[PDB]
Symmetry: D3
Subunit: 153 residues, 6 copies
Amino acid sequence: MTGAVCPGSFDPVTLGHLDVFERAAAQFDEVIVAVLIAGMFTVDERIEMIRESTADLPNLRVESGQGLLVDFVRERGLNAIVKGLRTGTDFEYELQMAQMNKHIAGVDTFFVATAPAYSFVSSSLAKEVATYGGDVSALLPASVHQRLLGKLR
Amino acid sequence: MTGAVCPGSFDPVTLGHLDVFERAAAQFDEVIVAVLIAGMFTVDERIEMIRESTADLPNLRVESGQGLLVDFVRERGLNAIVKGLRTGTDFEYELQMAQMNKHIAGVDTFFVATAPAYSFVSSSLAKEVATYGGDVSALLPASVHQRLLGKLR
Amino acid sequence: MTGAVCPGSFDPVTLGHLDVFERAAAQFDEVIVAVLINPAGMFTVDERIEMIRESTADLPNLRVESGQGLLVDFVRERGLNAIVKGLRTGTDFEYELQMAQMNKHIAGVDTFFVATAPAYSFVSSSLAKEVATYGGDVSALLPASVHQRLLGKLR
Amino acid sequence: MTGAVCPGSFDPVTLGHLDVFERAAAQFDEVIVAVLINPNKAGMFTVDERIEMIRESTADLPNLRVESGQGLLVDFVRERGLNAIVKGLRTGTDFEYELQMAQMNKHIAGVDTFFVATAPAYSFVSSSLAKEVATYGGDVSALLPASVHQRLLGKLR
Amino acid sequence: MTGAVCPGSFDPVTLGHLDVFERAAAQFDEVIVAVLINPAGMFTVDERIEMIRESTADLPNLRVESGQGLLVDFVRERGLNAIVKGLRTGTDFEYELQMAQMNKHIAGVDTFFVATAPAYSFVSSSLAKEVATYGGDVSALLPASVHQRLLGKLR
Amino acid sequence: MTGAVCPGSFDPVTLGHLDVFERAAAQFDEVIVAVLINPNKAGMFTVDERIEMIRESTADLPNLRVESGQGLLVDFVRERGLNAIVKGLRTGTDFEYELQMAQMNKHIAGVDTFFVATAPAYSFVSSSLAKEVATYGGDVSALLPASVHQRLLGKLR
Ligand SMILES: Cc1c(C(=O)O)cnn1-c1ccccc1
Ligand SMILES: Cc1c(C(=O)O)cnn1-c1ccccc1
Ligand SMILES: Cc1c(C(=O)O)cnn1-c1ccccc1
Ligand SMILES: Cc1c(C(=O)O)cnn1-c1ccccc1
Ligand SMILES: Cc1c(C(=O)O)cnn1-c1ccccc1
Ligand SMILES: Cc1c(C(=O)O)cnn1-c1ccccc1
């Protein structure tokens, strides 16, 4: 009965996130993606885009969440978070939250290294580049791309 | 059928390592500690010290290993490594090995943040301090302590 | 007569801060904690000062004052030229390193950093407040004097 | 016909920036300083003021020119027939952040980025910190070119 | 006439190195790859030079030479005063930053760093050799010219 | 009666070290420079040579003295009735490494450690790099005190 939660704003989900979801799904019986909550996409849109892109992952589901992440995790009977890291400075920042989360609620955090190809990918940078006309097609799920083009027009 | 391998030299295993073992054991059905191979303790001694300290973990076992870590992992039907991180610079160094390991053999790596109390603990520093008479009792399993005092006399 | 200033917003003071205060008061004849007022937070400056005084009652060579504007002026105005601050991480050091070099360049005021006690490496005022706002228990990270008042502000 | 673009907000230009300009100008046939403006947030200095302050302190660099722009930096670079950006770095933290943007810029436009290490004397200089310190009366004259410092005190007064 | 030196042991050259060579040759009129001999490794200096020449056949403005001793002497002896190097990480930058500042201080030679291509962020000569020694397949990380010879040295 | 210990191998002492000594001497009633010797590996300079080079360049610091030692630093500190160490740091990487040792030292002996940021001019100076560069003929005279530089060239010759 193993399981982890993968949290984030996912505004929108990127190939970097999807890679983390896939890897978490391969190592834990149950994965829940926690869409935490105003950016570009609504909660429902963000959830839909992730569901579309994770259809090949039978042991993953997507839910919105509010309040403390540890409460979200524990209220579903789990006590692990899985999170992707690019740096370095990411680890330092996330370490603080991870130790706090373990301290207040006994919830552990497992970090995975980003796939090399997506080291430079972030939701913020993808939206920024796309806004000014740059091609970010290779960095986002097929569905997501189109939806993003939609929001910009 | 989930599982991870926890690798290291463990010369000797510290409370920092034991904390990682416990956390891995709580999230994966099967944990294997891979004692990799001349420091202070022999392979057999290192294995024994870990077995002594992990008796309360029914789903963990301890084995020696040689060659590529990914071969050790895959030859036991697994494809996850779990490793503890203190920094920062640890993440940078380990990220390189993690991406290499994923590339050559499809083996993933999950990192956990060190418990705050053991941020300064390393096998090397514990042996160094103990050698010159410093008290490292609070940083090592009870059994290990005594064995270390033994080697020094 | 040696001395140092320990600056911060301390909104609220944490056990991490208090550890730094204690270690500074152990090594300098005089320590001044400077509670820096800004454009802002949860506690008033007077509330912050009083919480620090309560937690530092056992440190006779430390006192608490409010400050505004340029830190090196605050320091020099009081006949001192050293700052003492805690650091938790490497990136703590890199940001603080810039300010320390700037402060020494513009006023000849030096800065001494101490490493966090391991137990408080993850505590910050911001994170403590955020966790407490949503019902998380941060009593082990804050002095007794703070935890009671923090409950009051959230109710 | 080699060339590079040195981008920034330069609000204001610092001695650390000028060091980078000089080092780029010494290694590329032409250098363009790109003053990148956010049309949605004014800085301390207007675009013409930023350009003036840069020109006045680069007068001895014959192969350098100064132009403003906005939007994607890689478009600024490519429309001038170049494909190199040169930027200074102070810390490992700077490099991790800039690495993201450099790899993105190479991905979307094939434009490369060359980083140079700050001169030691300016490792702590930034436009924002110099403005903040000057706002509260601190002396930052040794961190800024002469073209900048009294213009800066003027803005604050 | 612009130019730069790309220094390293290149034992063996990787696709990461080659990416840096290509990017340097695209931006400077002349590039010299300097294969630095030391007290040592898997390949002879001549083997290393020949592997780089094979992988850089399409770069007419780049040439490969061996070097010994102080790098800034090598650079200045050839009428240049720029070094170009790849960086993979922040801690790459911090170590290289020291040497770059030293090299500019002692000889006025500057250093330009380029960020690794994402695909090769984890590749190093040391790790490639180590993996290959134990049967791991590193063919995707090394030029074709290297992978054949690496197999030979291990057999 | 405040005091601090400034530890190192000082093989040789650099201008970066001397900056740290001066800053410690300005803030503590007494400073002891601790020349820590590894009885198993000789450096470039003998203990007496290291001490001499330090004394000659700290002659204007009346509250500083120089002593050698080996073994645990915290024992050196405590046997002098002190419990503060002062050390310079250059980078975030330095801090992570030294943080480990500082926390260990506090754990085993209650001895505290105060770090100071390097002077910008010396951020790239290290004993090892200065020796390595000098070995191959590079000029490192501006990074070392006068008490050191020609002694160093002597060793290399
Ligand atoms: C952090 C991140 C974002 C973001 O934070 O916006 C978007 N993608 N990724 C990402 C996640 C894992 C690996 C690579 C990239
Ligand atoms: C890395 C390490 C060593 C070592 O590498 O020698 C000994 N303990 N630990 C450790 C492991 C996890 C958490 C804290 C400390
Ligand atoms: C920096 C800090 C904050 C803050 O930034 O608000 C709150 N506590 N601490 C802290 C201070 C010293 C040691 C550990 C933690
Ligand atoms: C990054 C920077 C700023 C800024 O970002 O505001 C102002 N100066 N510098 C600088 C540039 C190169 C070297 C040193 C300093
Ligand atoms: C640094 C390095 C080595 C090495 O250090 O031996 C081998 N490849 N690379 C590399 C170079 C540029 C980009 C990526 C990787
Ligand atoms: C660390 C160091 C060394 C060394 O470790 O060899 C030589 N100088 N410095 C130094 C000390 C303080 C500031 C700058 C530099």
